[PDB]
From Swiss-Prot, chain A:
It is found in: Nucleus. This is Mediator of RNA polymerase II transcription subunit 8. The lineage of its organism: Eukaryota, Metazoa, Chordata, Craniata, Vertebrata. It comes from the Eukaryota. The chain holds residues 127 to 186 of 268 of the full protein. Residues 16-25 are annotated as: Interaction with the Elongin BC complex. The gene is Med8. It comes from Mus musculus. Residues 30-50 are annotated as: Disordered. Component of the Mediator complex, a coactivator involved in the regulated transcription of nearly all RNA polymerase II-dependent genes. Mediator functions as a bridge to convey information from gene-specific regulatory proteins to the basal RNA polymerase II transcription machinery. Mediator is recruited to promoters by direct interactions with regulatory proteins and serves as a scaffold for the assembly of a functional preinitiation complex with RNA polymerase II and the general transcription factors.
Swiss-Prot record, chain B:
GO terms for cellular component: core mediator complex; mediator complex; nucleoplasm; nucleus; ubiquitin ligase complex. The lineage of its organism: Eukaryota, Metazoa, Chordata, Craniata, Vertebrata. The gene is Med11. InterPro entries: Mediator_Med11. This is Mediator of RNA polymerase II transcription subunit 11. Keywords: Acetylation, Activator, Nucleus, Transcription, Transcription regulation.
């Protein structure tokens, strides 16, 4: 039969609907990838000894 | 304490995200409803698991130089052991005195 049911809803229409769903999924995946590509780097934070070193106590 | 539960939840969420991605791909490729929302949720969960893994890997790196937290309160352990031994010896002596008293009466 090659479709087991229907004539207008045969393998042609099934392949068309599958291609439409695949295009929608690929568009969603591309949007997700473009949204996730914005991540530059895991910029953490820590102490700032560069200023306090010169600002450390002294004879003054 | 909380970091262990955090990592466990992150691993469980990564597994659930893999399962959800597989199920969404199956439902979308079976025939052509909620496949779009399923794929969106799967991608979001995968991104969240990746972000959690990156954050856990970007930890403060406590020591990374030598064996840290050296000394697990061994003195207190030995003190507790000696206290238990004292209690046991006192119990043995008390039982001996009780046996002597029972033999007396």
């Amino acid at each position: 039969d090659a479709a087991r049911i229907g004539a207008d809803a045969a393998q042609k229409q099934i392949q068309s609907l599958n291609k439409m769903c695949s295009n929608l999924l690929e568009k969603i995946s591309k949007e997700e990838r473009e949204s996730e590509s914005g991540g530059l780097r895991p910029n953490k934070q820590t102490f700032n000894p560069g200023d306090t070193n010169a600002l450390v106590a002294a004879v003054a | 304490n909380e970091r262990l539960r955090a990592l466990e939840d992150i691993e469980r969420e990564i597994g659930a995200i893999l399962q959800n991605a597989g199920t969404a791909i199956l439902e979308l490729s079976k025939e052509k409803r909620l496949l779009d929302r399923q794929a969106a949720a799967f991608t979001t969960s995968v991104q969240h698991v990746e972000a959690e893994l990156s954050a856990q890997i970007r930890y403060l790196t406590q020591v990374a130089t030598g064996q840290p937290h050296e000394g697990s309160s061994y003195s207190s352990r030995k003190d507790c052991q000696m206290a238990l031994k004292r209690v046991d010896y006192a119990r043995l002596k008390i039982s001996d005195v009780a046996r002597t008293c029972e033999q007396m009466l």
